[PDB]
Amino acid sequence: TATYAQALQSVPETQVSQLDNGLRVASEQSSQPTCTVGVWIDAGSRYESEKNNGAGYFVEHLAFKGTKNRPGNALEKEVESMGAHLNAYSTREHTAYYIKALSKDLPKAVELLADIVQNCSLEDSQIEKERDVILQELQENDTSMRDVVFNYLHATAFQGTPLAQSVEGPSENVRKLSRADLTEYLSRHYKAPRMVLAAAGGLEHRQLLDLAQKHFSGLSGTYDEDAVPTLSPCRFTGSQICHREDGLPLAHVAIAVEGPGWAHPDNVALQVANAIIGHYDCTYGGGAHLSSPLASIAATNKLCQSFQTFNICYADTGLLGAHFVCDHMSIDDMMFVLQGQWMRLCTSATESEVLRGKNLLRNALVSHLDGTTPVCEDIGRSLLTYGRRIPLAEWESRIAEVDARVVREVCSKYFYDQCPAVAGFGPIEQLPDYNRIRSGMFWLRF
Amino acid sequence: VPPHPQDLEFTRLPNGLVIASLENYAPASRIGLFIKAGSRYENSNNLGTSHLLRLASSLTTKGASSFKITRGIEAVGGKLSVTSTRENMAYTVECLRDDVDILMEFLLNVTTAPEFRRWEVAALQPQLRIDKAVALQNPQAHVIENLHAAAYRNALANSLYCPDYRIGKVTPVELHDYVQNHFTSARMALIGLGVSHPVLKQVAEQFLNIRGGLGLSGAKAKYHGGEIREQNGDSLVHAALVAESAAIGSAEANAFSVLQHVLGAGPHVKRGSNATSSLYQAVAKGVHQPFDVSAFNASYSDSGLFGFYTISQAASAGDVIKAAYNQVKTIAQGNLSNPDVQAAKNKLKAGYLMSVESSEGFLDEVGSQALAAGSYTPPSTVLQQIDAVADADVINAAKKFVSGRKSMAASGNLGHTPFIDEL
Amino acid sequence: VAPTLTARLYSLLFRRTSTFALTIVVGALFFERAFDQGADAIYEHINEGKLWKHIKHKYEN
Amino acid sequence: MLTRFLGPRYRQLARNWVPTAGLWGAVGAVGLVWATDWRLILDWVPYINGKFK
Ligand SMILES: CCCCCCCCCCCCCCCCC[C@@H](O)O[C@H](CO[C@H](O)CCCCCCCCCCCCCCC)COP(=O)(O)OCC[N+](C)(C)C
């Protein structure tokens, strides 16, 4: 035997040691022949100015195209030749560079990440080449209705705050950003107390810390002696953005209330409530028999091509709600059925559906944490948000605590009689007026 | 100190069925029933039957209603997935450790007791048109359908999606027929992760003793060749050029797999010139616009297709193809260094290992190994297999492609796209 | 008036439509008393003694 | 026709809705009392004394 409980204790503790730099260095060990190693940085768009809005996104384009020790090609050629994969990403709050490689290749993997993260050869010829690349990617993203509605939702919910900004920045900022603009953000943000070296797989935490001192130590000398930046809170605005385009065949609508942020214990109960409502897509086989009432009413009445719930978290704030895509004539019904479920959950959540929500969440959490890449990502992000790795047994503990009462107390706290941020795009004539949407945030019977 | 890792248990039962398990002490569990029942076992009278079948996984069974399969699996937060390839169907089931029993039972009902009710099948027919439409929005899907229809005169010619003329024409009897004669012991493998060997062996002994259908894994792919051309308008041109190569498992296939990494699979670095990719560098030399090129490698029970795949502007199509083709030619002519192969070995070896590092990719590999080979071959010896490939074999693989009767599919504005004839 | 009187009026009474209704009906009863005679008292002052209610005691048994 | 409505979910569904159903009764009572002037109920109310003898 092995009970689900016992399995959670078997997963080894994520070991953390700290460099004198302030570089937190962390690992989860296993018997795996491969690994993922990365650097997670406390930087994104929320740190940017308006006048340097695509800066982080720009460095991300330059980071793999040459260093002082490896000019141009050299990096690619090295990573490619050992069979490794090298990736990067940037959200509004976090930037990460990671290598998937053989476990034996960990010495060079860490070495290359050190060079990438500290010695970025921002050659003016390459920044100009990247200018066109990024501008071309801006036109590309315009065609993704989903990428737009979420940028739009960010733009309207976080009106006037750094969080309103996109990761990639506006066109003019891509067109006019200089090497100086780029070096300045780089030097102000890529500082050791805001960087986590994460690894997962066939490792030795001893060997990783050795490598971290070998390659990252070189950020000592003096640090933070002139200026330090800490994040200011971002005002949420219950507002609407409607981009009416009657030439696109399906409508995209993303609707959200203000969430609490990364740290808050009541993200668990929110996630459970979200699990209950879930997600649907026309290629699901279940249809009519799906548990989630919205999913089943969506499927039966073909109200929708796809919907998904989300709980997007930023430090001390977030976006809680759903996004859907549907035909022009189905926007109203989709909103009604969605808001009706939020209210059902707010006022009359029942015990068994809350079990299913908890069950979907334990399954999601355990399915996600499969392989070196997802776990390495979890170590990096967790340390940057929660300041530690929250072990799986603690997640189970915090999940098991949620009952029907918890769901309805917590859903009411965030959803009941709260102002949504609403973003619409495409054939949206039938998208409900804000007052009407706002009226769906309460019930006259309750 | 992590836990000392367990070893995989393997068993061929006398009846031909295969059981493989690994107690990985994971908080979740995964069970896959793999069946030699993919698209290839369809005939010219029942095309698309294995598509609707793939779509039918939660229709009503003896012992569990449609509504139960859905609500039962959803109650515990598990999944029921079905993945078809040209050779296999694979019914996969996920859940937390404590819940293996209910999902197993569901699994067994879907695979061994499907009822295929007249009206339920009737109601599911339109999902074929949506399912097909959602896949076919990748230009690559039609290219690889067409590539196969042209390569083979036979079984691998069949597509994993149902031909339009068949939608609403697949009968409840056709599926009953497909199951009774393909979902049999000797065509099956029951793979379990986070489960015990006695339990798998028990359910195998109790529930999976079915035999009364076809025998051959080789109803037999007769490779033929030729090309299919689809005028599209479509922003840029998709073209795949291919020759018959080597059946999966043979030594030759491993040479082809190395050739694929000498020339170039997908990228390794996010937004890169793909410096080690010899195909990419070759086209780039005289094409100064948006393009893509990769080596394409498909391995089957009794045939294989190797070559390359290209994405390019309408007018550059023929230049991109001819450049890629000539690059292969130079490797057949002898122009291949030892470190070139060494890097391809490392790219392949690392890639394979990464391919099995999660439980989803692990289970699929143990499953496909059980069907194709009737064995589990550990990574340690797969890497030894790869190492035994010499430079002269990789050269011999390129020599076989160059000199072998081609197959080609392509779609877009075909105005400046060549014709095999002209290659 | 520490977290505002309007904020505590919302969280205590206005949130649920039930307590919102109950506040109106309880409020409608209180207000009817303070307004009926409260406005009658203002009607008294503009007609200080010219009403029969003021005369009253002049013709009493 | 009523046996379908008895089970643990409906036990939770009734309890979830009872503070509300009670408060609507209080609305209806005060509402009926106030509208007809039920001096029977209203005589015992510490400010509403329009029957001021
Ligand atoms: C037709 C000819 C007549 C002409 C009349 C013209 C004169 C205008 C008067 C018409 C009436 C309009 C009323 C004013 C509109 C205000 C909206 C009101 O109806 O409130 C709604 C809801 O209705 C009330 O909540 C119901 C309260 C019930 C109070 C009792 C009313 C008195 C009737 C007594 C009942 C007893 C029955 C009688 C027994 C004999 C919505 O509230 P809302 O602004 O969106 O706030 C949302 C609620 N939150 C705060 C919980 C989020």
**Amino acid at site A219:** L
**Amino acid at site B148:** H
Give the CA-trace dihedral at A203, A209, A211, A213, to 10 degrees.
180
Q: Starting at the edge strand that comes first in sequence, how are the strands of the sheet with B28-35 ordered?
A: B9-12, B18-22, B188-193, B28-35, B89-96, B79-82
Residue A190 near residue A118 (C-beta atoms within 8 A): yes
- For residue A417, which residues of chain C lie inside 8 Å, CB to CB? 15
Q: Starting at the edge strand that comes first in sequence, how are the strands of the sheet with B237-244 ordered?
A: B226-231, B407-412, B237-244, B304-312, B291-299
Residue A288 near residue A300 (C-beta atoms within 8 A): yes
- d(Cα B48, Cα A378) in Å, to the nearest integer? 42
Q: For residue A211, give both structure tokens.
A: 């490598």
**Amino acid at site A127:** I
- d(Cα B134, Cα A117) in Å, to the nearest integer? 40
**Amino acid at site A424:** G
Residue B345 near residue B389 (C-beta atoms within 8 A): yes
Return the best residue to mutate from D32, D37, D38, D41 for the ligand 1 pocket (most ligand atoms within 8 A of CB).
Answer: D32
Q: Could you give all domains of chain B from N- to C-terminal order, each with its CATH number?
A: 1-211 (3.30.830.10), 223-423 (3.30.830.10)
Contact D16/A at CB under 8 A: yes
Give A370-407 as a DSSP string. -SHHHHHHHHHHHHHHTSS---HHHHHHHHHT--HHHH
Sequence-ordered alpha helix ranges (H) in A158-300 = 171-176, 179-189, 205-215, 267-277, 293-300
Contact A348/C at CB under 8 A: no
Check residue C13 and report its DSSP letter.
I
Contact A442/C at CB under 8 A: yes
* Alpha-carbon distance C61 to nearest alpha carbon in chain D (angstroms): 19
Q: For residue B320, give both structure tokens.
A: 């991109």
E strand or H helix that includes residue B75: helix B66-76
Q: Which atom of ligand 1 is nearest to the CA of C14?
A: 50
Phi and psi at B266, nearest 5°, equal: -55, 175
Give strand pairing partners of A308.
A279, A323
Residue B55 near residue B131 (C-beta atoms within 8 A): yes
Question: How many helices, marked H, and strands, marked E, lie in chain C?
Answer: 3, 0
- For residue B94, which residues of chain A lie inside 8 Å, CB to CB? 363, 367
Check residue C11 and report its DSSP letter.
I
Closest partner CB to A404 (pick from D12, D17, D20): D12
Domain residue extents for chain C:
1-61
Residue B88 near residue B368 (C-beta atoms within 8 A): yes
Residue B298 near residue B305 (C-beta atoms within 8 A): yes
Window 1-53 of D: residues touching C by CB (8 A cutoff) are: 19-20, 23-24, 26-27, 30-31, 33-34, 47-48, 50
Residue A309 near residue A274 (C-beta atoms within 8 A): yes
Helix or strand or coil: residue A119? coil
- The protein residue whose alpha carbon is closest to atom 39 in ligand 1 is D32
Cα angle C30-C34-C36, degrees, rounded to a multiple of 5: 110
- For residue D17, which residues of chain A lie inside 8 Å, CB to CB? 347-348
Return the best residue to mutate from C6, C10, C25 for the ligand 1 pocket (most ligand atoms within 8 A of CB).
Answer: C25
Sequence-ordered alpha helix ranges (H) in B113-153 = 118-124, 126-136, 139-151
User: Is the backbone of residue A359 left (phi > 0), alpha (psi -120 to 50) or beta?
Assistant: alpha
Residues 6+ apart with CB under 8 A from B315: B415, B416
Residue B238 near residue B140 (C-beta atoms within 8 A): yes
Q: Which CATH class is domain C1-61?
A: mainly alpha
For residue A1, which of B75, B4, B362, B101 has the smallest C-alpha distance? B101
**Strand-pair category, B237-244 with B79-82:** unpaired
Selected residue of C22, C35, C36 to mutate for chain D interface (largest D Cβ count, 10 A): C22
Helix or strand or coil: residue B129? helix
**Amino acid at site A212:** A
- d(Cα D30, Cα D7) in Å, to the nearest integer? 34
- The protein residue whose alpha carbon is closest to atom 24 in ligand 1 is C21
**Amino acid at site B105:** E
Query: Radius of gyration (Cα) for chain C, nearest Å?
Result: 20
Q: Could you give all domains of chain D from N- to C-terminal order, each with its CATH number?
A: 1-53 (1.20.5.220)
Residues 6+ apart with CB under 8 A from B156: B40, B86, B148, B221, B300, B303
**Amino acid at site D44:** W
For residue A79, which of A89, A67, A96 has the smallest C-alpha distance? A67
Cα B291 from chain centroid?
25
- d(Cα A436, Cα B65) in Å, to the nearest integer? 40
Cα separations in angstroms, D43 against B85, B366, D39: 84, 85, 5
Q: For residue B349, give both structure tokens.
A: 């070896």
Question: What angle in degrees, to the nearest 10, is found between the helix axes of C17-45 and D8-36?
Answer: 10
Cα separations in angstroms, B281 against A80, B120, B262, B293, D30: 14, 53, 12, 10, 85
E strand or H helix that includes residue A56: helix A55-62
Q: Could you give all domains of chain A from N- to C-terminal order, each with its CATH number?
A: 14-228 (3.30.830.10), 239-442 (3.30.830.10)
Q: For residue B311, give both structure tokens.
A: 């994405």
Q: For residue B351, give both structure tokens.
A: 């890639």
Q: For residue A271, give both structure tokens.
A: 């996630």
Query: Radius of gyration (Cα) for chain B, nearest Å?
Result: 23
A 10 A CB-CB count for C50 gives 8
- d(Cα B247, Cα B154) in Å, to the nearest integer? 16
Ligand 1 center from residue C13 Cα (angstroms): 16
Check residue C3 and report its DSSP letter.
S
HSE, side-chain direction, 13 A CA sphere, residue B121:
20
Contact C17/A at CB under 8 A: yes
Closest partner CB to C18 (pick from D23, D33, D34): D23
Solved how? X-ray
Instruction: Please judge whether A404 and D8 are an interchain contact, meaning their C-beta atoms are less than 8 angstroms apart.
Output: no
- d(Cα A55, Cα A45) in Å, to the nearest integer? 8
| Chains B+D touching (3+ CB pairs under 8 Å) | no
Cα separations in angstroms, A426 against A149, A158, A327, A430, A433: 10, 22, 10, 11, 16
- d(Cα B242, Cα B298) in Å, to the nearest integer? 10
A28 flagged as catalytic: no
Q: Which residue in the block uniquely carries the two structure tokens 């036109």?
A: A139
User: Is the backbone of residue A218 left (phi > 0), alpha (psi -120 to 50) or beta?
Assistant: left
Cα A338 from chain centroid?
23
- d(Cα B266, Cα B250) in Å, to the nearest integer? 24
Instruction: Please judge whether C17 and A443 are an interchain contact, meaning their C-beta atoms are less than 8 angstroms apart.
Output: yes
